[PDB]
């Protein structure tokens, strides 16, 4: 039986462990996790939310950008709708509020407390702006939840409100975040409305937003201050149309995502996207591939990022229907040896379950990971809501935020076992060891 | 422990995956799946229905021939009965209908609707031929289901019927399919009865059959236009008698099927079958074998097709009772290296569960696959009927048709991962990679 | 402990069986099941589709009236929604199809299979009328699934169609069912389009609709030949609005439906509706009640039918939350004694689980039964069909959300229940619904005797 | 077999339903539920927190009196423990906070988030008063969670605080709720500290406490504005000690609580307490009973309320160990006939599982119901909360140990039960608790009829 032993043994994440190396690290938080998503796109955490229609739309995209990562919006929708999602991601970081909740001076405390829990936002609005007329919108005062805790249901909103003269107002529609933070701190207030010279209520700035924006400090932003976001396209005819309309809406990178990335359809597409001037303005990521040969071919075809993995995913029907694939650790080992030498970063899409699995991916040479099942069912994932249902039905996992922080925590910890202080070090310094059948079960 | 490491490691389908290779394919349907069942028997799809008494009798045999494959009728029955099955398979493609459902002009609409759902065919008959007398059978008219939807239960069939003069009739018992299709199209009708010069109702041709015959266009046919079909025989004394009576009935190939194909009983039999002139008119397939040595021996013994697999089947009691066998991927790898060089095609009988498993078999060198559990319980498999019971009891799987189409779809897709555009390419171009324990469980 | 000995014992359907009596019935369908829903509404079968939002909307009320009973549209919905529902019902016996599936001469046989199987109706359409322009709409021909069975996907429609000169046509937008039946026979065709003096496509009449209206000969109809359907209101100031518009929508009866009908709220609602001309034109059914006294009270208020049952509803939660009710069989025995002496029909609402339960309800005095649980989850019941684990279910979003198991179509179910009931009448020696009411005799079971069934 | 035919049949809550009667009620909250716990104690809602060690201690008795009923502190504890509990209850309506969370000018914003979220109370505190020394305690300012939202962890408190000259202050340690309400309005602040003539921090009053006392307008109060709470004793020589100290602790009623109250032990206990001035100053509730005779016996002994139920308690094991009891509904029907003819209220203790059960109990004659099982495992019930398998439970160590399933907060539960009961009153045609008692009519169910609910 000769032919039956030429066949190499491929390894997946669960086949190996990170051998512990000497660590000079002397600080729980001194490891740096900055990486590169593609050739000209750095990320502060190396986590990418997957372009699966059960994972990443606007909410997911915004959340991960803010945690310092990024999501790639799926393509299983219209072109218009995909850019609809995209255009919303770019507005997400605005601390200005058009159309804030208004109220008239002669309504009662019962109505004030009605409008404070309007079905518009979760938790309600934090205040109401007291205006003279719902079409004029001249600022007369402000009313918070506090101002109503001691008044009768049928009491004049005009009496409880803080009057506009006693308010901190601003007439500068292009006001900084630094300056509005100053006005909030200087006036011991949490609401700075923005008024025209006339007196009109143009915008509202509230301290919730100012706090949430000073918080997410590792956030991955573009040049114009908006949140980074990627979009996924196919290889068909109408897919070049989709790719133009997506860079219009504001895509920062485009990901071409076919099942078999080592194809002519993909190579041709990458060459196309990097060729036309309407789309070469953003980095072009290609996948999925699993061989070293595939890697050279796609970098050659002009690609700025590779996505690694032909069939290892939570929904890799590929191996049951086609019987194709590569165990994902080998696929990363083989594909990063090529793409590293050509300065091309790689996403390790597929097959990740633990944070420890993420250290394994990075140490095998990956620059980022694409997360699948691990994010489906989180608040910001799509699907009605304890369980979430989009067809599909996954249990609720909570907010994406603290799930990715513990995830980065694990990698940070995994890096320390490799004695690495940076993502590049993690890639170069990690040495693996295989386990057997009985080896995983402990 | 020296002797305990000379022993080679054998691989089964679930041990390996198809590594993805560059695919120049630029069309979802451009891969060709034609193959060869034996030396002088081509098939359009490489799927063979197994000679198990729970899988392939006349219904199964006809279905798979029509999908462009073939079944091999089992031998666990009489000789007469086996050719009974066979003689029926060869009549299956006739678009002529002897003894069509007749009715007399003076019966009522209630009786007309009775005879339309006679317990003879599923869904009923599509029409009734109105004749003057049940022994004479002179054509007076035709009555469809439509003609009765507006008539009272006790109404004259003679009034509702379309009269024979207003019908499209033909007097040509040897009429083409092309010509009868023309008469149906030219007369906007779906029934063309065939009458003697006298006036008698000899045959009926109906559009259901004409449609179903223009549909199954990849159908595997013999020279005389009948559907291909194979038969299985043993190696005993009465088995040579069975083999003569089977080529009489119309067998296109004979399969000798012993548990241990690498025997003298089999070699002797193959030599016998290829020797006698009553049986050398059809190709002779031999099995089952699992070693390269076995392959040479049986081609030498005059065989035109090899069946690969000593004990990997869904009911391979072989390994528990005798402890013999070979992991089926190695068995195919080793046995096709020999039989390819001698232009002899191989069936990869045993152990297939997914379509992906089928790509694996083809890529390991097989020319066709023999399907077992995957077809038991389909409509056209034997056994009363939700579950089917023949003793045995399997759940109902539906119609064989759409199960084999998705199956060929998977192989077609599996081929694309190998970068193959034809069965030969799939065999030559596929390169495998092994998975470990943890490697299959993702 | 005497205070506890003067509490009477109420009985429910599982406490009794019908004592068999001498049956002079031979022909198992010389048994009449017609009855009255209210004073001025007769039904062919005594089944009613309960006004629950998991049971009766457009499609259930249609099915139920075609089978010979009636459905009561629920009110857990806006007024506009309840009247829209009622309006769909009131036009489902029309055999004139407005705007039927068109197609133009130069499209392909591929473009035609696409048009025929598109789910315009549940299943699809059976022909496409061939016009020259989707606006002018002059009729040139007709194409049916059969014209396509022998052409490549690339063949034009003009190629395979039957031209208009060889179809049967009419210009009488007011054509009688007879008349069109006639043209379909005489011309041996299944489609008669109705065209304008010009030649434009105005309407299409298909054989299938003609064959429906010729079948369901038991269908519950109003004077204009439309399906009977009721609608439900409550007892708030706005339910008067709701009623008014439901009548203008064409409701045939209103059912005032509160969980405690023996109340001034309920009475005053019934008196309102009777005293307004915009609603007094239709029968007023009031409930729910469960004493003789309540019956007498709502009949005095004006009610044209009573709905019986405080408590026994399947997904009724009255018993647990409030601890109030009356076992249903006792309830029906008490109220209908009152209601028969004044000519007011009763609906026995709640707790029915088998046709034998329906037998017991009618035997105990009732004219009609309301079925919620037994009908929910059918084809024609509301809620979307979704597959899980090789089994089908229905999901009904927004309620008074949950998943009931798919029961198939309601027509066969309703026809067994009527058969079951006809069978039970034969045990009572009853050739009519009224006979069932007067003749039935009950015997009580202990818990043991229930296990024996 | 005659000896077995003269045994009467007692009924329990599942044997009956309330027969609906004519309801003249329109406004679903023109239904009064106030009632009497004993001769000289009225409650707004007829619910009582049973004196079981898995149900009523400090936090349950507070919640129950704020909701408008009362809790009975259990005695499975030392005397000191029972009086400590009662004392915590008697001071939970005080809006003066003694020793509130301090902090000194030179600490960090990190040192302040630490102080605000520390679980002084369940949730934390809302401000930290800024004093210069943890001993002298002169007030300099106030810091709230909002003052911190825009400063690095390393910023001083003096930096972000509001200085005392810009706060609203008072020096009246006797300030009225009105007065402080007034300063909170007029100064648009949520905190009014009370300081000394010097400037030391004496007390702090927060808006939240002011908003509580302005809400719970139904709270059960004593003459000094404190929550009503009862406490339980037994019938041993030392229970006299226990009672004496429980009264000096401020108990509002005592509940003598043995499993067989129709006994000289029980009677003699009731007579004792009435004849000692150190305890006769509060109402004496005696139980448990279950016959008319026992009622008459304890009323004669002096009892100001009776507790009904020998047996039906959830974790009562009387029936199995002793084989004694009376079905609860029969028990209540028997005793309250006696008790109404003498002006003594009754508590129906034991066996309640739904609001409809509460409806049946009041309808059968009772003035108040005791709930053990239904309240155990709530937020305010005793026992520690621990998580297992994605579900929360409570563990109550040392008993009369086990794990009950977390039910949430008791206020919503108590408010449904009252709603449920109000609903049941509407079936009885009852606009008051007494009306419920006089008007309710029962009907019996067989086992079958119970399944139908």
Residue numbers in the entry:
A (entry chain B), B (entry chain B): 3 to 387, 394 to 398, 431 to 482
C (entry chain A), D (entry chain A): 3 to 402, 431 to 483
What does the paper say about this structure?
Here, we demonstrate the determination of the crystal structures of T. brucei GMPR; a protein that, unlike the GMPRs of host animals, possesses a CBS domain. We further show that TbGMPR activity is regulated by purine nucleotide binding to an allosteric regulatory site formed at the cleft between the catalytic and CBS domains of the enzyme. Our kinetic and structural analyses clearly demonstrate that the CBS domain has a pivotal role in the allosteric regulation of the activity and structure of TbGMPR, facilitating the transitions among three conformations: a tetramer, and octamers with relaxed and twisted conformations. A combination of X-ray crystallography and size-exclusion chromatography small-angle X-ray scattering (SEC-SAXS) analysis clearly revealed that TbGMPR can exist as a tetramer or an octamer depending on the nucleotide species that is bound to the CBS domain.
To obtain direct evidence for the allosteric binding of purine nucleotides to the CBS domain of TbGMPR, we attempted crystallization, with or without purine nucleotides, of the inactive mutant TbGMPR C318A, in which the catalytic residue Cys3186 was replaced by an alanine. We obtained the crystal without ligand (C318A apo) and successfully determined the structure, at 2.80-Å resolution, of a GMPR harboring a CBS domain. A monomer of C318A apo comprised two domains: the catalytic domain (Ser2–Phe97 and Arg226–Gly484) and the CBS domain (Leu98–Ser225). The former displayed a typical TIM-barrel fold with accessory α-helices and antiparallel β-sheets, whereas the latter had a tandem repeat of α–β–β–α folds characteristic to all CBS domains known to date. The interactions between the adjacent subunits in the tetramer involved a large number of hydrogen bonds and hydrophobic interactions, whereas the formation of the octamer was stabilized by a hydrogen bond and 14 C–C contacts between the CBS domains of subunit A in tetramer 1 and subunit A′ in tetramer 2, and equivalent interactions between subunit B and B′, C and C′, and D and D′. However, no interaction was observed between the catalytic domains, indicating that the CBS domain is essential for the formation of the TbGMPR octamer. Thus, it appears that GMP induces the transformation of TbGMPR from a “relaxed” (C318A apo) to a “twisted” form (C318A/GMP). However, the relative orientation of these domains was obviously different between C318A/GMP and C318A apo: the CBS domain is rotated ~40° between these two structures, a change that may be induced by an interaction between the base moiety of GMP and Arg93. Two of the three conformations were the crystal structures of C318A apo and C318A/GMP that represent the relaxed and the twisted octamers, respectively; the third conformation was a tetramer structure generated by dividing the C318A/GMP octamer in half.
